[PDB]
Amino acid sequence: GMNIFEMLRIDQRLRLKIYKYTIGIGHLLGVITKDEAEKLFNQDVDAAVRGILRNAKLKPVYDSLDAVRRAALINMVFQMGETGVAGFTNSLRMLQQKRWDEAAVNLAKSIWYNQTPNRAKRVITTFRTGTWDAYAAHMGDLPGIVRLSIALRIQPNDGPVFFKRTIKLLTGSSYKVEVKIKPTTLQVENISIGGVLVPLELKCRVVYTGIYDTEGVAPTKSGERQPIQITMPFTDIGTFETVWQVKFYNYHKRDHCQWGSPFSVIEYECKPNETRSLMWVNKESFL
């Protein structure tokens, strides 16, 4: 009995305070309650279906679709409005004609996909298959988002780190690590960086610090890069894990870690889940 309401609860974060303007479960436009957000959400789903049915470009497609694929169309209209979705002229035709694979391929070429690829890929799987397969692993998503940032500075002079995205690191060195987490109540004890354990201590988003030691790390073979696993368990909400692509340089080639594109921080948007082996890592931004 999965349905559009639960689908949108997975795809659209809930906010009780205005944010860019927007509030509730993606209600476009200063503090509302949970029940009032839920009523607004139900009204907004209603408005999306009413907009489909009034629109001469969307109603015939909607009518022709099964209940599951109808939810995918409502999801798009909820996200971007009736007029925007009615602009998907070719894909709509493909859906009406039961050309599920062509529609799915065409929808993924859109700027919509590029702007919100995780949500778009789920919506597209729903159109393609007429099943809720793409939402199965999101059963149990926690309602909130986790934001965390990781920054490195080379000691002793708080020096910058550069990419070229391949991060350029120096062996035989010490880096100050800063991890900033929202919400501030979340707790971590350690981050592992390529198998190097970095104990983290809270100071003062909430800010954790440690020191990442690269003494004894082998330099990367010339013209090659390498992944390093990044792992940070949280106390209750699961484990953050990702890969960085890095090149390690020795003392003689240290000039390579003095030039390039700097990154002050990498920002991650994550979504915890009750039972998934790892939190969802939805966005990574080098800044």
CSV table of C-alpha atoms in Angstrom, one decimal:
chain,number,residue,atom,x,y,z
A,1,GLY,CA,0.0,0.0,0.0
A,2,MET,CA,3.0,2.3,-0.6
A,3,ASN,CA,1.9,5.5,-2.2
A,4,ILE,CA,2.6,9.1,-3.3
A,5,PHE,CA,2.4,10.5,0.3
A,6,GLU,CA,5.1,8.2,1.6
A,7,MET,CA,7.1,8.6,-1.6
A,8,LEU,CA,7.1,12.4,-1.2
A,9,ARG,CA,8.0,12.0,2.5
A,10,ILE,CA,11.1,10.1,1.4
A,11,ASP,CA,12.0,12.6,-1.5
A,12,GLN,CA,11.2,15.9,0.2
A,13,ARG,CA,12.6,17.0,3.5
A,14,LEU,CA,10.3,18.5,6.1
A,15,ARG,CA,11.1,21.9,7.5
A,16,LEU,CA,9.1,23.7,10.3
A,17,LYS,CA,10.9,27.0,9.8
A,18,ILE,CA,11.0,29.0,6.6
A,19,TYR,CA,13.8,28.2,4.3
A,20,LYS,CA,14.7,29.0,0.6
A,21,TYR,CA,11.1,30.7,0.1
A,22,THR,CA,9.8,27.4,1.4
A,23,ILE,CA,8.4,25.6,4.4
A,24,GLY,CA,6.9,22.3,5.5
A,25,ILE,CA,7.3,19.4,3.0
A,26,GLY,CA,8.4,21.5,0.1
A,27,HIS,CA,5.7,24.1,0.4
A,28,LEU,CA,6.8,27.1,-1.7
A,29,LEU,CA,5.8,30.7,-0.8
A,30,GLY,CA,7.5,32.0,10.6
A,31,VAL,CA,7.3,28.7,12.4
A,32,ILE,CA,4.6,26.0,12.0
A,33,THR,CA,3.9,22.8,13.9
A,34,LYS,CA,4.2,19.2,12.6
A,35,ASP,CA,0.5,18.8,12.3
A,36,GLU,CA,0.2,22.0,10.4
A,37,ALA,CA,3.0,21.0,8.0
A,38,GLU,CA,1.2,17.7,7.5
A,39,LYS,CA,-2.1,19.4,6.6
A,40,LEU,CA,-0.2,21.7,4.2
A,41,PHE,CA,1.4,18.6,2.7
A,42,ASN,CA,-1.9,17.0,2.1
A,43,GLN,CA,-3.3,20.2,0.6
A,44,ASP,CA,-0.2,20.4,-1.6
A,45,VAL,CA,-0.6,16.8,-2.9
A,46,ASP,CA,-4.3,17.6,-3.5
A,47,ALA,CA,-3.2,20.7,-5.5
A,48,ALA,CA,-0.8,18.7,-7.6
A,49,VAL,CA,-3.5,16.1,-8.6
A,50,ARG,CA,-6.0,18.9,-9.3
A,51,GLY,CA,-3.4,20.6,-11.5
A,52,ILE,CA,-2.8,17.4,-13.4
A,53,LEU,CA,-6.5,16.9,-14.0
A,54,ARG,CA,-7.1,20.5,-15.1
A,55,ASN,CA,-4.2,20.5,-17.6
A,56,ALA,CA,-5.0,19.2,-21.0
A,57,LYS,CA,-1.4,18.1,-21.5
A,58,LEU,CA,-1.2,16.1,-18.2
A,59,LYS,CA,-4.7,14.6,-17.8
A,60,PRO,CA,-4.6,12.2,-20.7
A,61,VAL,CA,-1.2,10.8,-19.6
A,62,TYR,CA,-2.3,10.6,-16.0
A,63,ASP,CA,-5.6,8.8,-16.9
A,64,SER,CA,-3.6,6.2,-19.0
A,65,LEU,CA,-1.2,5.4,-16.2
A,66,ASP,CA,-1.5,2.8,-13.4
A,67,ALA,CA,-1.6,4.0,-9.8
A,68,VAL,CA,2.1,3.6,-9.2
A,69,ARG,CA,3.2,5.5,-12.4
A,70,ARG,CA,0.6,8.1,-11.5
A,71,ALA,CA,2.4,8.7,-8.3
A,72,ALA,CA,5.6,9.4,-10.2
A,73,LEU,CA,3.8,12.0,-12.2
A,74,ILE,CA,2.3,13.6,-9.1
A,75,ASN,CA,5.8,13.6,-7.5
A,76,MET,CA,7.1,15.7,-10.5
A,77,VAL,CA,4.2,18.1,-10.4
A,78,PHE,CA,4.6,18.5,-6.6
A,79,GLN,CA,8.3,19.3,-7.1
A,80,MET,CA,8.1,21.7,-10.1
A,81,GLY,CA,4.5,22.6,-10.7
A,82,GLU,CA,1.8,21.7,-13.3
A,83,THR,CA,3.2,24.1,-15.9
A,84,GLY,CA,6.7,22.8,-15.6
A,85,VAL,CA,5.8,19.2,-15.9
A,86,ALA,CA,3.5,19.9,-18.9
A,87,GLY,CA,6.6,21.0,-20.6
A,88,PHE,CA,8.0,17.5,-20.7
A,89,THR,CA,6.3,17.0,-24.0
A,90,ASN,CA,8.2,14.1,-25.5
A,91,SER,CA,8.5,12.1,-22.3
A,92,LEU,CA,4.8,12.5,-21.6
A,93,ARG,CA,4.0,11.1,-25.0
A,94,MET,CA,6.3,8.2,-24.4
A,95,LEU,CA,4.6,7.4,-21.1
A,96,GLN,CA,1.1,7.6,-22.7
A,97,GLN,CA,2.3,5.1,-25.4
A,98,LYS,CA,3.7,2.7,-22.8
A,99,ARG,CA,7.2,3.3,-24.0
A,100,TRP,CA,8.6,2.9,-20.5
A,101,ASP,CA,12.3,2.5,-21.4
A,102,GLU,CA,12.3,5.4,-23.9
A,103,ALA,CA,10.6,7.6,-21.4
A,104,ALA,CA,13.0,6.7,-18.7
A,105,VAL,CA,16.0,7.4,-20.9
A,106,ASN,CA,14.5,10.7,-22.1
A,107,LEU,CA,13.7,11.9,-18.6
A,108,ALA,CA,17.3,11.4,-17.4
A,109,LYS,CA,18.6,13.8,-20.1
A,110,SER,CA,16.8,16.7,-18.4
A,111,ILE,CA,18.1,19.5,-16.4
A,112,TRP,CA,15.7,18.3,-13.8
A,113,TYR,CA,17.7,15.1,-13.5
A,114,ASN,CA,21.0,17.1,-13.2
A,115,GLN,CA,19.6,19.3,-10.5
A,116,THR,CA,18.1,16.5,-8.3
A,117,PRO,CA,19.6,13.2,-9.6
A,118,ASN,CA,18.9,11.0,-6.6
A,119,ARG,CA,15.2,11.9,-6.5
A,120,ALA,CA,14.9,11.9,-10.3
A,121,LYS,CA,16.4,8.5,-10.6
A,122,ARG,CA,13.9,7.1,-8.1
A,123,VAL,CA,11.0,8.8,-9.9
A,124,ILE,CA,12.3,7.5,-13.2
A,125,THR,CA,12.6,3.9,-11.9
A,126,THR,CA,9.0,4.2,-10.8
A,127,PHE,CA,7.8,5.3,-14.3
A,128,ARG,CA,9.9,2.6,-15.9
A,129,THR,CA,8.8,-0.3,-13.8
A,130,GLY,CA,5.4,0.6,-12.3
A,131,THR,CA,6.9,-0.6,-8.9
A,132,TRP,CA,8.2,0.9,-5.8
A,133,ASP,CA,11.5,-0.8,-6.1
A,134,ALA,CA,13.5,2.5,-5.9
A,135,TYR,CA,11.9,3.3,-2.5
A,136,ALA,CA,12.4,-0.1,-0.8
A,137,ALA,CA,15.8,0.7,0.6
A,138,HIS,CA,14.5,4.1,1.8
A,139,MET,CA,11.9,2.5,4.1
A,140,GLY,CA,13.2,3.5,7.4
A,141,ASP,CA,14.8,6.8,6.3
A,142,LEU,CA,15.0,9.1,9.3
A,143,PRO,CA,13.1,12.4,8.7
A,144,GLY,CA,16.1,14.7,9.2
A,145,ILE,CA,19.1,15.5,7.0
A,146,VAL,CA,22.6,15.3,8.3
A,147,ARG,CA,25.0,17.9,7.1
A,148,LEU,CA,28.7,17.4,7.6
A,149,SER,CA,31.8,19.0,6.4
A,150,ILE,CA,35.4,17.8,6.4
A,151,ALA,CA,38.4,20.1,6.1
A,152,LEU,CA,42.2,19.5,6.1
A,153,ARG,CA,45.0,22.0,6.7
A,154,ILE,CA,48.6,21.0,6.5
A,155,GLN,CA,50.8,21.7,9.6
A,156,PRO,CA,52.5,23.8,10.7
A,157,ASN,CA,51.2,26.9,9.0
A,158,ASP,CA,47.6,26.0,8.4
A,159,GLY,CA,48.4,25.5,4.8
A,160,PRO,CA,46.0,24.8,2.1
A,161,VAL,CA,45.3,21.5,0.3
A,162,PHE,CA,44.6,21.4,-3.4
A,163,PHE,CA,42.9,19.1,-5.9
A,164,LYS,CA,43.9,18.3,-9.5
A,165,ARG,CA,38.6,15.6,-8.3
A,166,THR,CA,41.9,14.2,-7.1
A,167,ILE,CA,43.2,15.5,-3.7
A,168,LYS,CA,46.9,16.0,-3.5
A,169,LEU,CA,48.4,14.9,-0.2
A,170,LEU,CA,51.9,14.9,1.2
A,171,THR,CA,53.3,11.9,2.9
A,172,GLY,CA,55.4,12.4,6.1
A,173,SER,CA,53.1,15.1,7.3
A,174,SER,CA,50.4,16.1,9.8
A,175,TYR,CA,47.1,17.7,8.9
A,176,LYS,CA,44.6,19.4,11.2
A,177,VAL,CA,41.2,17.9,10.5
A,178,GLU,CA,38.0,19.8,11.2
A,179,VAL,CA,34.6,18.0,11.0
A,180,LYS,CA,31.5,20.2,11.4
A,181,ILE,CA,28.1,18.4,11.9
A,182,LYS,CA,24.5,19.6,11.9
A,183,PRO,CA,22.5,18.9,13.9
A,184,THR,CA,24.8,19.8,16.8
A,185,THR,CA,23.5,16.9,19.0
A,186,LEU,CA,25.1,14.2,16.7
A,187,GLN,CA,28.2,12.6,18.2
A,188,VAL,CA,31.3,11.0,16.6
A,189,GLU,CA,34.5,9.7,18.2
A,190,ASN,CA,36.8,9.0,15.2
A,191,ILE,CA,37.2,9.4,11.4
A,192,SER,CA,39.4,6.9,9.5
A,193,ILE,CA,41.2,8.3,6.4
A,194,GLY,CA,42.8,5.7,4.3
A,195,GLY,CA,43.2,3.3,7.2
A,196,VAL,CA,44.7,6.1,9.4
A,197,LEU,CA,42.6,6.5,12.5
A,198,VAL,CA,42.0,10.1,13.5
A,199,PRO,CA,40.5,10.6,17.0
A,200,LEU,CA,38.1,13.5,17.1
A,201,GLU,CA,37.4,15.8,20.0
A,202,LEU,CA,34.5,18.2,20.3
A,203,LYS,CA,35.5,21.9,20.6
A,204,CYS,CA,33.6,25.2,21.3
A,205,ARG,CA,27.2,23.2,13.5
A,206,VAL,CA,29.2,21.4,16.2
A,207,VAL,CA,33.0,21.2,15.5
A,208,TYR,CA,35.2,18.2,16.0
A,209,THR,CA,39.0,18.3,15.5
A,210,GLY,CA,41.8,15.9,15.2
A,211,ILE,CA,45.2,15.4,13.5
A,212,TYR,CA,45.7,13.2,10.4
A,213,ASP,CA,49.2,11.7,10.3
A,214,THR,CA,50.6,10.6,6.9
A,215,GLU,CA,54.0,9.4,8.2
A,216,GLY,CA,54.4,5.9,6.8
A,217,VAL,CA,51.9,6.3,3.9
A,218,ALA,CA,53.3,5.1,0.6
A,219,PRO,CA,53.5,7.7,-2.2
A,220,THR,CA,51.2,6.9,-5.1
A,221,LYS,CA,52.9,5.5,-8.2
A,222,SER,CA,53.5,8.0,-11.0
A,223,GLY,CA,50.6,8.9,-13.2
A,224,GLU,CA,48.2,7.0,-10.9
A,225,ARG,CA,45.8,8.0,-8.2
A,226,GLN,CA,44.1,5.9,-5.6
A,227,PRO,CA,41.0,5.8,-3.6
A,228,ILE,CA,41.1,6.1,0.1
A,229,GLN,CA,38.1,5.1,2.2
A,230,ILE,CA,36.7,7.7,4.6
A,231,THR,CA,34.7,6.2,7.5
A,232,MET,CA,33.1,8.1,10.4
A,233,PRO,CA,30.7,6.1,12.7
A,234,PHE,CA,28.1,8.1,14.6
A,235,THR,CA,27.0,7.0,18.1
A,236,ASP,CA,23.3,6.2,17.2
A,237,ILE,CA,22.4,7.1,13.6
A,238,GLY,CA,24.8,4.9,11.6
A,239,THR,CA,28.0,5.3,9.7
A,240,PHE,CA,29.2,7.9,7.2
A,241,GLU,CA,31.3,6.3,4.5
A,242,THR,CA,32.8,7.6,1.2
A,243,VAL,CA,35.9,7.5,-0.9
A,244,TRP,CA,38.3,10.2,-1.8
A,245,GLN,CA,40.4,10.0,-4.9
A,246,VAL,CA,43.9,11.0,-3.8
A,247,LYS,CA,47.6,11.2,-4.9
A,248,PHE,CA,50.2,11.0,-2.2
A,249,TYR,CA,53.5,12.8,-2.9
A,250,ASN,CA,56.9,12.5,-1.2
A,251,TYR,CA,59.2,15.2,0.0
A,252,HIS,CA,60.9,15.6,-3.4
A,253,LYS,CA,57.6,16.0,-5.2
A,254,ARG,CA,56.1,18.2,-2.5
A,255,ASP,CA,55.9,21.1,-4.9
A,256,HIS,CA,52.8,19.3,-6.3
A,257,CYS,CA,50.9,20.1,-3.1
A,258,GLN,CA,51.6,23.8,-3.4
A,259,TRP,CA,49.6,24.5,-6.5
A,260,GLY,CA,46.2,23.5,-7.9
A,261,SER,CA,42.5,24.3,-7.1
A,262,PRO,CA,42.2,24.8,-3.3
A,263,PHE,CA,39.4,23.2,-1.3
A,264,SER,CA,38.6,24.7,2.0
A,265,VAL,CA,36.0,22.0,2.8
A,266,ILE,CA,34.0,19.2,1.4
A,267,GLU,CA,30.4,19.4,2.4
A,268,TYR,CA,28.2,16.3,2.5
A,269,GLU,CA,24.4,16.1,2.7
A,270,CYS,CA,23.4,12.7,4.2
A,271,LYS,CA,20.2,10.9,5.2
A,272,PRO,CA,20.3,8.4,8.0
A,273,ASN,CA,18.3,5.1,7.9
A,274,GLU,CA,17.3,2.7,10.7
A,275,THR,CA,18.6,-0.4,9.1
A,276,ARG,CA,20.8,0.5,6.1
A,277,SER,CA,24.4,-0.6,6.6
A,278,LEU,CA,25.5,3.1,5.9
A,279,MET,CA,23.8,6.5,5.8
A,280,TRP,CA,22.8,7.8,2.4
A,281,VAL,CA,25.4,10.2,1.0
A,282,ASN,CA,23.2,12.3,-1.2
A,283,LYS,CA,25.5,15.2,-2.2
A,284,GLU,CA,29.2,16.0,-2.1
A,285,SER,CA,30.4,19.6,-2.7
A,286,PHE,CA,34.0,20.7,-2.9
A,287,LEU,CA,34.2,24.3,-1.7
